[PDB]
Design a protein around this ligand. Structure first.
Ligand SMILES: [Ca+2]
Length: 240
């Protein structure tokens, strides 16, 4: 997250850290959202490579023991059938991970609230992006969970020539673009928390930013619109 601030520890309890094994150590690569005690929602491009993955819930500081963490392996990876790694702009950047074991829900680990199917947010709706991603374009990961206020930019505006153009589809959500705050590598797969009817619900899965950089004016961070995949998500978890 570029231009963010440290989140209160465990204040976004559904946020998870997706890590892969490199040699004898682990490395954070993406964010994700705990949607069931044994299911995590993340981006399809996060699990494109064939690596050994593990999920960490209740995490805050990636380099030290917070005394609230739970580590669990990934038993099954279900990528959306239409995902095309060579065309992130085509959408479908979403994947569900079945954990090897059910995590224990508590003060630091809770399920993320998903929007009702088809829900579209009005322009400039209040949302927050969270993650351990780069804090600057081509910079380095954050040690502690970061958050940044990132209001939405509706489809009409986001798909206009002044912004992303035809690169963005109606199956995506745009947020930010103020040139100061944005998501960045490492935030991918993470949530976009938006305030709806008094509660924060996960409306987006961090998907991509401009090749020019993370925080670029009029180039909002783009997210997979969760509400477009509710039926798919329910069908996977009910038959797996
Ligand atoms: Ca920690």
């Amino acid at each position: 997250v570029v231009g963010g601030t440290e989140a209160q520890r465990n204040s976004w309890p559904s946020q998870i850290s997706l890590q892969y094994r490199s040699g004898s150590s682990w490395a954070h690569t993406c964010g994700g959202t705990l949607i069931r005690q044994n299911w995590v929602m993340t981006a399809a491009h996060c699990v494109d490579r064939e690596l050994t993955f593990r999920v960490v819930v209740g995490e805050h500081n990636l380099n030290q023991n917070n005394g609230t963490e739970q580590y669990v392996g990934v038993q099954k990876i279900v990528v959306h059938p239409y995902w095309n790694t060579d065309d992130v702009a085509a959408g479908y950047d979403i994947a569900l991970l079945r954990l090897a074991q059910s995590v224990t829900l508590n003060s630091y680990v809770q399920l993320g609230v998903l929007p009702r199917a088809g829900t579209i947010l009005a322009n400039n709706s209040p949302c927050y992006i969270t993650g351990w991603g780069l804090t600057r374009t081509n910079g380095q990961l954050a040690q502690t969970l970061q958050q940044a206020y990132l209001p939405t930019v509706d489809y009409a505006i986001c798909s206009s020539s002044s912004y992303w153009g035809s690169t963005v589809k109606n199956s995506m959500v745009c947020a930010g673009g103020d040139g100061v705050r944005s998501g960045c590598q490492g935030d991918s797969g993470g949530p976009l928390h938006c305030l709806v009817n008094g509660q924060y619900a996960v409306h987006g899965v961090t998907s991509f930013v401009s090749r020019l950089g993370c925080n670029v004016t009029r180039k909002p961070t783009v997210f997979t619109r969760v509400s477009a995949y509710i039926s798919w998500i329910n069908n996977v978890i009910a038959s797996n």
